[PDB]
Design a binder for this molecule. Structure first.
Ligand code: NA
Length: 181
């Protein structure tokens, strides 16, 4: 079953209010010029990986990391598919020691969704419209475009309450208070 951890600074936020703030600041990747666009980084495999990590293309700190079995179809349909088990949001993505093939991490982790079971399929013979209806694609691509609503709809359809503040949300627990951030 999906569970959540959150940094105490976000105790008064909900999933919906957090993802709105995150996505607004991440901003729409399509509006970034090519020269400064972060298209995201796959690692863990020899356009696929067990981790996909992406930061804002607009010189803001927001970033996201997905872990699971992730794939991207590139040209011409640009569909994200596979399985996301863990989805994490925060700020200031950095490459792990050993470089990009070792993965990335967020310097500040705000919210982590565990056992999210977010999936989608890709069929190379089907239309782009059909392939883009998958839960994983619409939610990840929406977030990349500054739009959390597809992700929120997927979460609501899983029975997750995206309205409750984290402090009151049964499936969420606060990361222990620390002092290094
Ligand atoms: Na709670």
């Amino acid at each position: 079953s999906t569970t959540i951890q959150y940094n105490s600074n976000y105790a008064d936020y909900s999933i919906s209010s957090y993802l709105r703030e995150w996505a607004n600041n991440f901003g729409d990747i399509d509006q970034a010029p090519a020269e400064t666009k972060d298209r995201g980084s796959f690692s863990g495999s020899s356009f696929s990986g067990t981790q996909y990590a992406i930061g804002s293309s607009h010189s803001n700190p927001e970033g996201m990391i997905a872990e699971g079995d992730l794939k991207y179809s590139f040209m011409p349909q640009h569909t994200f598919h596979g399985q996301i088990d863990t989805l994490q949001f925060g700020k200031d993505l950095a490459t792990n020691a050993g470089g990009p093939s070792a993965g990335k991490h967020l310097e500040k982790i705000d919210i982590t969704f565990n056992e999210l079971d977010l999936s989608g399929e890709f069929d190379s013979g089907k239309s782009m419209t059909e392939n883009h209806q998958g839960d994983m694609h619409k939610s990840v691509r929406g977030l990349m475009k500054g739009n959390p609503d597809p992700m929120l709809e997927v979460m609501k359809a899983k029975g997750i309450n995206v309205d409750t503040a984290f402090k009151d949300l049964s499936i969420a627990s606060q990361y222990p208070d620390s002092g290094y951030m």
